[PDB]
Amino acid sequence: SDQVPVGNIPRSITVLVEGENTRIAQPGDHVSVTGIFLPILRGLLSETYLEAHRIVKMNKSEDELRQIAEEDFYEKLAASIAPEIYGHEDVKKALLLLLVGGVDQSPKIRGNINICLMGDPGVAKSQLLSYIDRLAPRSQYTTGRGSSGVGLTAAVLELTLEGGALVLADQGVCCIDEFDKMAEADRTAIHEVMEQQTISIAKAGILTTLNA
């Protein structure tokens, strides 16, 4: 989004990975790819694509001890979460745990932590939600009804299955803003995720049980 022209929309390009360049990138992964811009023959108009040669996962998708052993190291990470956001010392310490998450036990109880920041307008709720997105390894930030319905869950698109923010955020942190003003069906879908950690769909063209 930082490099799209002011009045334009992001442009998409095709990449044909092969050999040992497969199963390296999943949907939603920020990737720098070095390949060859080659056309596929169809005047002699020709489509294009990138023949992948080197795939690297960047930023959050990217893939000393003395300070970690410190007593206050717990506070330091907390104080380092969105430092420009003054105060909220306790909240950041709670979000820190959300990033770390509990530990799954299978005697199957989930090990995730769900934190809802409810408050009055202009108390930097969104900024923290936006900050977590730029920090968590796998994350998705959906706001209100802009990305609703199939935006969260999956859809059928041969017919393949495409996951929504939850699926892309699977084993990650899905930052939901304005949860209260979310579509009632979407809230129901989340209810399953925060307890079942799955998305059971039985629509017309879809009958699966996703893993979120």
Partner: protein
């Protein structure tokens, strides 16, 4: 010798036919599983070689199949296992020759329609197919999944019967390598191009296409479910219905696809599919399916006597109830209800009565606040029984829960596909968050709960799909909390007609009890750091389904009548769930279910009393009052 479409080095390999043949014969003649458990292998004289007894069974029954466990070969000889897995095409014919030689050396006078063909199974499980590689092409693999759909029979030619247009001379050409060599010149009168192929006089085998959903135990982050295509050939057609959970062992086939269904040009990219070699319906983490119950030879006499002895213990019911979901604490009544649901009532035939089908399953609605361990029970039962399904309210629709129509993107034909409810025909449908369900999709459940059928009438086809499902629904109180100020029926927030369908509405409330809180905290903490085994409960349920067919008795009938009258009097209040005639039927089922637990084969006073007690304990009728609340 029925040809199988599924199927010095020969060429570019590491196998010589004689070596594999002799090694397989040896393995078949001198293999004993040391850790074999008598129950694990029923009706087999363990001390003697296993597969020779298998051959004896084949001689007796006549089934010309030998289910060979690939793990047995792996243990006995790893090199032969490598050869088999790497080159299933060449190895399996060698095994067929070996087993035929062994079984005609002994029993030289046995009669079979064709020769005996081996079926390797339980090959090293491929956790996730996506992890498969082009290096794994044309190799035996075993996967586990659920069958979404099965297509109708497709006849595939094996021998072409040609006749001369002039002299009518008949010859049978045989498929060579996927092609038939048209003679192009008659052998009788020598006329050119006078041989025409005749379809109906030719020889055909079967081929069934099965679209199967895999349940890969290795689920990388963000990976969507995966569906694959299987081909079943000449005996495995319609061996698995939609909804069945299977372990499929077969050859990983990749075939060319033509850019159009008419031009000979093919995409550089292939698309892969499995040729089924063996189906395994057994799973140690679930109960026995209906097919396993159907076949009689599943319970060794010792195991049958063990189950009989278990049934004679007074605490059989409570021991069985305590077995379900050991990680859930002191839900004795709920677990008893789920046990009665698993056992199910008698399946009766009412065609002669002119009454129609009668529902013999049991539907349990757990109404409770979100905090209570509701969804855990539903997920456990969904992860316990076969032919089970799960739904989460707003995530489903009526058409998707009943049936729909779609263009199969491998034959490009508009075909009808079943829904979630049908897939669990003879299983259990766990409907979670039942309250958060629009009335449109809810309306469907009425027929599935009373009639057990689903009569669709749409442009595509008009027909009624039979669905004998048992519904395990979970609902939250209106306002997400069971406020004691509102009456029971008001708090449930469901139409009275629908609540009448359910035969057990368990109210999961939170009694502010210190002892219960302390014990539950102890239990949960113990779980965080951590009986009657599955192998015995599973067998008990399978046997009870197979043999026990309880029939009502005089005293049971009288007690049921009196109990129904008492229920009608009790539920006649304003806020309590009113009692209808449909509830009497419910009691019957429950009673029968309990009578099925004791293997009584006849419902008597105790069973009806237990059914009435369980129903009254549900709805907390004792803890309620005429001033409902």
């Amino acid at each position: 010798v029925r040809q199988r479409p599924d199927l010095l080095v020969i060429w570019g390999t590491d196998v010589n036919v004689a070596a594999c043949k002799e090694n397989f014969q040896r393995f078949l003649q001198r293999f004993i599983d040391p850790l074999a458990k008598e129950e694990e292998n029923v009706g087999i004289d363990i001390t003697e070689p296993l597969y020779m007894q298998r051959l004896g069974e084949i001689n007796v029954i006549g089934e010309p199949f030998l289910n060979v466990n690939c793990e047995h070969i792996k243990s006995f000889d790893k090199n032969l296992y490598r050869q088999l897995i790497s080159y299933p095409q060449e190895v399996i014919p060698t095994f067929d020759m070996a087993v035929n030689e062994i079984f005609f050396d002994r029993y030289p006078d046995s009669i079979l329609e064709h020769q005996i063909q081996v079926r390797p199974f339980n090959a090293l499980k491929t956790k996730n197919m996506r992890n498969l590689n082009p290096e794994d092409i044309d190799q035996l693999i075993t996967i586990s999944g659920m069958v979404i759909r099965t297509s109708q029979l497709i006849p595939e030619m094996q021998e072409a019967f040609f006749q001369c247009q002039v002299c009518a001379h008949t010859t049978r050409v045989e498929m060579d390598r996927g092609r038939i060599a048209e003679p192009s010149v008659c052998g009788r009168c020598h006329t050119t191009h006078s041989m025409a192929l005749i379809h109906n006089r030719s020889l055909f085998s079967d081929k069934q296409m099965i679209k199967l959903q895999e349940s890969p135990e290795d689920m990388p982050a963000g990976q969507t479910p995966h569906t694959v295509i299987l081909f079943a050939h000449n005996d495995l057609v319609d061996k698995v219905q939609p909804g069945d959970r299977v372990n499929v062992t077969g050859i990983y086939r990749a075939v060319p696809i033509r850019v159009n269904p008419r031009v000979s040009n093919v995409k550089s990219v292939y698309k892969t599919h499995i040729d089924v070699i063996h189906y395994r319906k057994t799973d140690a983490k679930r109960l026995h399916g209906l097919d396993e119950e159907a076949e009689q030879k599943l319970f060794s006499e010792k195991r049958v006597e063990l189950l009989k002895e278990l049934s004679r213990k007074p605490d059989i019911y409570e021991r069985l109830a305590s077995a379900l979901a050991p990680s859930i604490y002191e839900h004795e009544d709920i677990k008893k209800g789920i046990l009665l649901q698993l056992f199910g009532g008698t399946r009766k035939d009412f065609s002669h009565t002119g009454r129609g089908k009668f529902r013999a399953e049991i539907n349990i609605l757990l109404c409770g606040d979100p905090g209570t361990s509701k969804s855990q029970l539903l997920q456990y039962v969904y992860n316990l029984v076969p032919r089970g399904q799960y739904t989460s309210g707003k995530g489903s629709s009526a058409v998707g829960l009943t049936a729909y129509v779609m263009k199969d993107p491998e034959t490009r034909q508009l075909v009808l596909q079943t829904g979630a409810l049908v897939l669990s025909d003879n299983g259990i449908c766990c409907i979670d968050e039942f309250d958060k369900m629009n009335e449109s999709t809810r309306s469907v459940l009425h027929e599935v709960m009373e009639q057990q059928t689903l009569s669709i009438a749409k442009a595509g086809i008009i027909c009624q799909l039979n669905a004998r499902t048992s519904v395990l629904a979970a609902a939250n109180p209106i306002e997400s909390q069971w406020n004691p100020k509102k009456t029971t029926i008001e708090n449930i927030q469901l139409p009275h007609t629908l609540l009448s369908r359910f035969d057990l509405i368990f109210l999961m409330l939170d009694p502010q009890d210190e002892a219960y809180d302390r014990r539950l905290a102890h239990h949960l903490v113990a779980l965080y750091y951590q009986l009657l085994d599955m192998a015995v409960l599973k067998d008990y349920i399978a046997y009870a389904h197979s043999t026990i067919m309880p029939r009502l008795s005089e005293e049971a009938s009288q007690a049921l009548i009196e109990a129904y009258v008492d229920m009608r009097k009790i539920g006649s209040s304003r806020g309590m769930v009113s009692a209808y005639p449909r509830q009497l039927e419910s009691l019957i089922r429950l009673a029968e279910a309990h009578a099925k637990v004791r293997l009584s084969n006849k419902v008597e006073a105790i069973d009806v009393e237990e059914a009435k007690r369980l129903h009254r304990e549900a709805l907390k009728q004792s803890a309620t009052d005429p001033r409902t609340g």
